[PDB]
Design a protein around this nucleic acid. Structure first.
Ligand SMILES: Nc1ncnc2c1ncn2[C@@H]1O[C@H](COP(=O)(O)OP(=O)(O)NP(=O)(O)O)[C@@H](O)[C@H]1O
Ligand SMILES: Nc1ncnc2c1ncn2[C@@H]1O[C@H](COP(=O)(O)OP(=O)(O)NP(=O)(O)O)[C@@H](O)[C@H]1O
Ligand SMILES: Nc1ncnc2c1ncn2[C@@H]1O[C@H](COP(=O)(O)OP(=O)(O)NP(=O)(O)O)[C@@H](O)[C@H]1O
Ligand SMILES: [Mg+2]
Ligand SMILES: [Mg+2]
Ligand SMILES: [Mg+2]
Ligand SMILES: [Zn+2]
Ligand SMILES: [Zn+2]
Lengths: 440, 619, 401
DNA sequence: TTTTTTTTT
């Protein structure tokens, strides 16, 4: 129960048991790691066992035979040594941690054994473990290894292995336990409370109204838009041709166009708050690399790697793009090429790959001349290309009605929002949002 | 008798300690004029310092009661006591500071008969120079300089003592690291093997270190110089005590170090790198509205503020005291007063997010030679967190946030812009009509939702930017044209125009009497305003303590006025009103009640806010 | 220790070739004698770095030719004489015939007024001049002479300069990957004069960069990973042609001078220089120019004294040390002049733009002539001379009306 | 690799 914030990881707290929370950015592949080793003396053939490894590959300081003078000439034995499964991960500060005017911090995390590959990018997690310090192991020279800097802000000096060189350190978290922060057999298993509540919800004949009025309590009217977004959350059934390899896409796409102050950004923000795997973006602050997936190369390693961008973190979820019409044509072409195939392809430097991008897109835009013109068809009022416009199941157009009764109703809804916030008071919805989350 | 001397100087350690013990036990002179950030202590919550006692003996009570572990030593007091000791402190800080500490700890232990978790530490401050005026004579001397904080690093562990373990028999030894160097044991005293020990890193002891980058102030400099930057190193309890965007003064030791020609080899370059080891950060400044949530104000000045609030003239008295050199423009001054006060904060505290915007945005649009830039300069100088940008000097990425590749790790990293540095402050944007459209169009998300969401290569996150935007511009033709309407003299998108809470049209009313009065005012510069010290305390107290709520009568009245706004905005050649303007009216009403120090918004407050909004635009 | 890079001077370069550079190491008391944008005389020893070798210059002595209680005897005669204003006006570029009032305007721009900082609000002290005229009337010759006369000054043309070369630039170092700032012409000219030739042919989005410099005397930048403010305390002297290469007497002043009002209000003086054929003046001008081509020097037919360029530079440097204060009795004269000036712009058929910057311009010119007189209190004679020059500048824009 | 800026076509 003793949570600490990421910025509180002082050098005082090395070696103690600590809990922390963060969002995962990268998940490196799996390697075996040496833990306890056996070495054969090349002079006399005796095996020396259980040489415990540090961060660096090490040979014994002395032959186990008491009548032998060797201290250098050794050979490792593989079939007597013990190997450990290993994984390295990077995490980032969650948004609720951040101080005034600040950019999030990042940490490197080490995982071992049965916890390997138990978590994916985009997850938000709690970690229990300890804080450790790891050195710059490339500066040392021993039997069996010379220094990499010799092969190819002030540190510690004095060691036999550090002839003229110096040693510096980095922080890392050595995880002891990691987890995420939050069909008939499953239906049987959620037995008393969940089956009772969800069966009552399934029996409810006005569940459409009762769900939309709880998902969007702060918005008046727009029943068509509310129902369309609710159906977008559920989606259709994806189907594969049994031998052709072709498939029938089950994902639904929605687009919103309308006049200023018609609650487009309100709808998109509400969807991203509700859904478990949804992401929100702005078209003015995005690039084709960051939107869907990107190529990066490492500097701890030196090989090329793939970053899962926002669409792949929202795979089997919703990607919300606000101000879609203000994107560059390059980035719009990248989105259209991904939407056509539901795949992303990479061919750069020394990596080629193909990826999956099964995400539903929700988009918002403003009309070209500032206000929607009813005297022309939809092709002229929106700056999208016709191939991109072909990708959307539903278009919705929102206009200012200039009507006294609707103006009065909108004003009352806004002041009810302000009044409820002013006294910390909930509205009386039919269902809880958590119950709706369980149902969906 | 063996005796200890500082190498090559004939200073003996103990004779300084005698005089400093006398200084601590005896000095009481300056306490009639105790400073703003030094006049309160605490056992619990806050308490006020008494004048009549020896001052540092009084300050030691805070270390006993609240368990504070440091003393801020004002060097002007020491210079008044004895210059012969002040000279030694400034000339040899790397040698005498480890013993004045021990005198403080001795006096504390004698006075209170008590021990603590860490030693009480000294921080000398208020010794001033410029970054360019430093010379090789100043190496290892005490200096103080000032500037703005742009960047801070992550923490670095710095070892003080290592831990060795024998590989053969598991015996273990500690070893202190000193002069930058550790000493490795050779022979194991238990099992008598040689060249046998291995260092265990995580059994050893470390300390915190942080790097801070500091920038020159541009004001003092001679002709043609561009501003410089300096590296400042913070150790221990000073770590993470400052943010980017803050303006500070630093007192520390000026140092110089060598660099290796190759990292592989022993040879050194004969030109040395320089930096500062910090000892004290100060951020107190009396020329601005203060930066500290108003915790330290006395009961008597709180009662003076409460008495001042009962004038019926309170709006005019506060407004006309702002920007005193500017003649007339009283409506614009009242608008700037509303910008300074703001509405009620409305945040989700579980997620630390703004539910609704409470900051007020203002546009000034008018003829040339009407002091719009001067009003921007006054607002820029008044506030603690402020930024000023102008014209085509900005880019869309520089205003918000940028991605760049790191120097050594070669990763892509994110770094701040103007609107993120102006968080809980004001951004002033001059020549607003002459920006690039790409640079101007990123303001929509910040001005409406107070957040900033980014998606670039390997970087997907969201930042908070709770800034207030104040802008100035010309019409399309640079002089206002009477053969055109308001929405043709201004040309901005309706999406941008609807996000301002106030728009001020400033058109030259051509009149001989007004010309003569303004000419007299301008010529006189070559030949009941509220005090700044009271205005600071008034604004800080009001912000910390007043949170207006709407009355039911006011809510009904606000709906009626919004319907009138919707009808008035629909006429030809005029700015249309959206549902956003209802939120604007609520913000202005709360600002008026906040100036009056009232916990409730009244119909009179709504009437004054609506009158100000209407008369700002009917020109 | 300090390090410099030094470039060849233009007269030293061979024909059709670009100048070269060299690295210089400076030690001890010779440091801090130079900054960027200076012309120097250097003595030093040429050495290698410890079989092909790299080299540098180890400086022994440095002298600023920008800079170099002592007074010359020729200046002592002037300082004892007094009444020097007419001779000082005549001594600016004596090869150029006439334009006495234009030379007086340039003489005032070379000195300027006082900076004012009342109650935290700053006001610019220096004077801005815009010249216009028909082709072939010696605008470029006057700008070249002013550039030689001023201590620290820069020269630019409308085509050869970007809005980043005038203000300041972001430089991306390819070796390190770093970003840095690089000061442009108005930064290098800080404390001095910038001359801008062919001012009408600059692009609008390049021209609008000087709006902040001409009134607030700062440059402020927010780009990439940089956010700073730079000082630019410079006077600007500009030259242009009218809107179609010649003045048109059928079109208005605003049509002849094709500049926006916001930019026009930032210039303290605006002048027009015509070329019109006349059978006596053409012969007199031909006599003057042919004498200069004969003898290499101006005629001086009246045998009056004229001042050398070096001692004129010395005298202007002496004039800049004074800060004369305004007499409070001049208030009614200045304010009444401002009101009378503002009446005509309402009630004229061919008006110009007038704004509250005008009265500050009047005060600047009065203090400038007091500095030229080396007095410490402003006189009503100086106020009257400022009003006379402003009246001349106004009347230049309506010839033959 | 990807990102940001200023001159050139
Ligand atoms: N039907 C509605 N019910 C309640 N509030 C509404 C409604 N329509 C608009 N609003 C209000 O309109 C304001 C603007 O909302 P917003 O989400 O920005 O719409 P928008 O169309 O995305 N604005 P923009 O991004 O400029 O086009 C908010 O204060 C909403 O509360
Ligand atoms: N009412 C006034 N009070 C004080 N100073 C004034 C007033 N009117 C004009 N001035 C002066 O006139 C100048 C106005 O310059 P400035 O501040 O740039 O105005 P502006 O509105 O920004 N004009 P511009 O930036 O070109 O569109 C300054 O020198 C001011 O001191
Ligand atoms: N009054 C004059 N006295 C002496 N030389 C003159 C005079 N008028 C013109 N000239 C000569 O005319 C030539 C052109 O001078 P220049 O300075 O280029 O004119 P300009 O005003 O710059 N024309 P332009 O740059 O095309 O607008 C030079 O050789 C001058 O010496
Ligand atoms: Mg929106
Ligand atoms: Mg201005
Ligand atoms: Mg010319
Ligand atoms: Zn052996
Ligand atoms: Zn041992």
């Amino acid at each position: 129960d003793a949570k600490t914030k990421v910025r509180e990881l002082s050098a005082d707290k090395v070696g103690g048991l600590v809990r922390i929370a963060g969002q995962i950015v990268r998940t490196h592949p799996v390697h075996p790691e040496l833990s306890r080793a056996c070495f054969v003396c090349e002079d006399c053939g005796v095996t020396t066992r259980d040489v415990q490894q540090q961060f660096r590959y090490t040979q014994p300081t002395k032959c186990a035979n008491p009548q032998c003078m060797n201290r250098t000439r050794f050979s490792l034995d593989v079939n007597s040594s013990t190997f450990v499964d290993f994984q390295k991960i990077r995490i980032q500060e969650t948004q609720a941690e951040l101080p005034r005017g600040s950019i999030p911090r990042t940490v490197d995390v080490i995982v071992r054994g049965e916890m390997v590959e138990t978590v994916q990018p985009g997850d938000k997690c709690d970690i229990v473990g300890t804080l450790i310090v790891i050195p710059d192991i490339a500066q040392l020279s021993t039997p069996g290894l010379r220094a990499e800097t010799s092969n190819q802000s002030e540190g510690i000096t004095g060691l036999k292995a550090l002839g003229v060189r110096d040693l510096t350190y980095k922080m890392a978290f050595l995880a002891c336990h990691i987890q995420q922060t939050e069909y008939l057999d499953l239906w049987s298993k959620m037995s008393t409370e969940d089956r009772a509540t969800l069966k009552k919800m399934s029996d409810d004949k006005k569940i459409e109204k009762n769900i939309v009025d709880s998902l969007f309590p702060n918005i008046y009217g727009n029943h068509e838009v509310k129902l369309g977004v609710l159906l977008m959350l559920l989606g259709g059934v994806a189907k594969k041709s049994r031998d052709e390899g072709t498939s029938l896409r089950g994902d639904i796409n929605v687009c919103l166009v309308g006049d200023p102050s018609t609650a487009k950004s309100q709808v998109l923000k509400a969807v991203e708050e509700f859904s478990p795997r949804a992401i929100y973006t702005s078209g003015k602050a995005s690039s084709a690399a960051g939107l869907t997936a990107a190529v990066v190369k490492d500097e701890e390693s030196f090989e090329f790697v793939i970053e899962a961008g926002a669409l792949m973190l929202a795979d089997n979820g919703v990607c919300c793009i606000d101000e879609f019409d203000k994107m560059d044509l390059k980035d719009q072409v990248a989105i259209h090429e991904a939407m056509e195939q539901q795949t992303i392809s990479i061919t750069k430097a020394g990596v080629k790959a193909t990826l999956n991008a099964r995400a539903s897109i929700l988009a918002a835009a403003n009309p070209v001349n500032g206000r929607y013109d009813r005297s022309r068809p939809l092709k002229y009022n929106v700056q999208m290309s016709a191939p991109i416009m072909s990708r959307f199941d539903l278009f919705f157009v929102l206009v200012d009605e200039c009507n006294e009764v609707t103006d009065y109703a909108i004003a009352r809804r806004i002041l009810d929002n302000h009044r409820a916030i002013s006294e910390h008071t909930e509205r009386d919805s039919v269902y809880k949002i958590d119950d709706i989350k369980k149902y969906i | 008798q063996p005796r200890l001397y500082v190498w090559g100087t004939r200073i003996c350690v103990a004779d300084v300690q005698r005089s400093f013990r006398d200084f601590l036990t005896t000095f009481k002179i300056s306490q009639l004029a105790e400073d703003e950030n030094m006049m309160t202590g605490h056992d619990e919550a806050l308490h006020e310092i008494d004048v009549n006692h020896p001052y540092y003996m009084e300050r030691l009570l805070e270390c006993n009661d609240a368990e504070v572990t440091h003393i801020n030593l004002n060097l002007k007091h020491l210079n008044a006591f004895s210059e012969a000791l002040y000279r030694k402190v400034i000339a040899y800080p790397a040698d005498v500071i480890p013993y004045l500490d021990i005198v403080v700890n001795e006096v504390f232990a004698e006075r209170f008969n008590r021990t603590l978790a860490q030693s009480i530490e000294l921080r000398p401050f208020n010794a001033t120079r410029n970054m360019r005026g430093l010379n090789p004579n100043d190496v290892d001397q005490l200096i103080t300089i000032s500037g703005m904080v742009t960047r801070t690093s992550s923490l670095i562990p710095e070892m003080r003592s290592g831990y060795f373990q024998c590989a053969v028999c598991a015996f273990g030894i500690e070893s202190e690291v000193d002069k930058g160097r550790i000493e490795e044991p050779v022979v194991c005293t238990n099992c008598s093997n040689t060249h046998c020990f291995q260092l265990v890193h995580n059994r050893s002891v470390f300390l915190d270190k942080q790097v801070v980058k500091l920038q020159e102030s541009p004001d003092d400099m001679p002709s043609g110089e561009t501003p410089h930057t300096v590296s400042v190193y913070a150790h221990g309890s000073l770590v993470e005590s400052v943010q980017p965007g803050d303006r500070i003064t630093v007192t520390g030791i000026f140092r110089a170090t060598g660099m290796k020609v190759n990292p592989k080899q022993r040879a050194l370059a004969s030109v040395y790198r320089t930096s500062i080891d910090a000892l004290h950060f100060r951020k107190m400044d009396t020329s601005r509205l203060h930066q500290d949530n108003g915790e330290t104000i006395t009961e008597e000045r709180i009662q003076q503020i409460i008495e001042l609030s009962k004038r019926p003239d309170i709006m005019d008295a506060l407004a006309q005291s702002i920007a005193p050199s500017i003649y007339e423009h009283d409506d614009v001054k009242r608008g700037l007063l509303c910008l300074l006060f703001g509405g009620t904060r409305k945040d989700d505290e579980t997620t630390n997010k703004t539910k609704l915007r409470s900051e007020i945005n203002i546009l000034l649009c008018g003829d040339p030679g009407t002091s719009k830039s001067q009003m921007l300069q006054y607002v820029y100088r008044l506030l603690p967190r402020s930024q000023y940008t102008s014209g085509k000097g900005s880019s869309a990425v520089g205003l918000t946030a940028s991605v760049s590749r790191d120097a050594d790790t070669k990763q892509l990293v994110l770094q701040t812009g103007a609107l993120v540095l102006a968080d809980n402050g004001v951004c002033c944007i001059d020549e607003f009509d002459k920006m690039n459209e790409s640079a101007r169009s990123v303001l929509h998300e910040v001005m409406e939702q107070q957040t900033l969401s980014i998606a670039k290569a390997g970087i997907i996150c969201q930042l908070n930017a709770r800034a207030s935007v104040l802008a100035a511009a010309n019409p399309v033709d640079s002089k206002w044209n009477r053969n055109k309407t308001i929405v043709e003299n201004i040309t901005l998108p309706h999406t941008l125009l609807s996000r301002f809470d106030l728009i001020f049209l400033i058109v030259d009313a051509q009149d001989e009497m007004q010309d003569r009065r303004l000419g007299n005012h301008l010529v006189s510069l070559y030949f009941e305003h509220v005090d700044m010290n009271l205005l600071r305390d008034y604004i800080a107290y009001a912000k910390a303590n007043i949170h207006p709520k709407l009355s039911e009568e006011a809510s009904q009245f606000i709906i009626e006025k919004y319907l009138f706004m919707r009808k008035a905005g629909a006429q030809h050649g005029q700015i249309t009103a959206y549902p956003r303007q209802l939120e604007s009216l609520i913000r202005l009403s709360e600002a008026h009640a906040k100036i009056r120090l009232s916990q409730e918004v009244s119909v009179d407050d709504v009437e004054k806010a609506f009158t100000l909004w209407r008369e700002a635009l009917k020109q | 220790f300090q390090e410099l890079k030094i470039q060849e001077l233009s007269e030293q370069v061979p024909v059709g070739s670009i100048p070269r550079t060299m690295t210089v190491h400076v030690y001890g008391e010779m440091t801090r004698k130079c900054n960027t944008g200076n012309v120097v005389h250097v003595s030093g020893v040429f050495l290698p770095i410890m079989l092909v070798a790299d080299t540098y210059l180890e400086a022994h002595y440095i002298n600023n030719l920008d800079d170099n209680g002592v007074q010359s005897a020729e200046l002592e005669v002037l300082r004892r004489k007094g009444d020097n204003y007419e001779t000082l006006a005549a001594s600016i570029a004596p090869e150029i015939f006439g334009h006495v009032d234009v030379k007086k305007c340039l003489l005032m721009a070379l000195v300027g007024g006082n900076d004012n900082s009342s109650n935290g609000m700053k006001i610019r002290g220096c004077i801005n001049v815009l010249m216009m005229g028909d082709p072939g009337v010696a605008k470029s010759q006057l700008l070249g002479y002013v550039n030689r006369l001023a201590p620290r000054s820069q020269y630019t043309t409308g085509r050869g300069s970007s809005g980043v070369g005038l203000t300041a630039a972001v430089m991306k170092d390819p070796v390190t990957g770093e970003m840095s700032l690089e000061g442009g012409a108005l930064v290098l000219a800080d404390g001095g004069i910038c001359c801008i030739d062919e001012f009408d042919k600059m692009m609008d989005h390049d021209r609008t960069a000087i709006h902040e410099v001409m009134e607030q005397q700062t440059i402020s930048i927010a780009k990439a990973g940089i956010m700073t403010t730079l000082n630019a305390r410079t006077a600007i002297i500009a030259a242009a042609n009218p809107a179609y290469g010649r003045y048109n007497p059928n079109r208005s002043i605003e049509q002849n001078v094709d500049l926006p009002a916001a930019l026009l209000s930032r210039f303290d003086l605006i002048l027009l220089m015509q070329d019109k054929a006349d059978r006596e003046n053409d012969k007199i001008l031909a006599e003057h120019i042919t004498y200069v081509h004969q003898h290499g020097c101006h005629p001086n037919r009246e045998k009056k004294d004229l001042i050398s360029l070096e001692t004129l530079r010395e005298y202007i440097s002496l004039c800049k040390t004074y800060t004369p204060t305004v007499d409070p009795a001049l208030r009614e004269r200045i304010v009444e002049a401002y009101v009378e000036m503002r009446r005509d712009a309402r009630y004229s058929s061919d008006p110009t733009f007038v704004s509250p910057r005008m009265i500050l311009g009047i005060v600047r010119m009065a203090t400038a002539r007091a500095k030229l007189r080396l007095s410490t209190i402003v006189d009503e004679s100086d106020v009257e001379e400022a009003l006379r020059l402003m009246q001349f500048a106004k009347d230049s824009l309506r010839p033959e009306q």
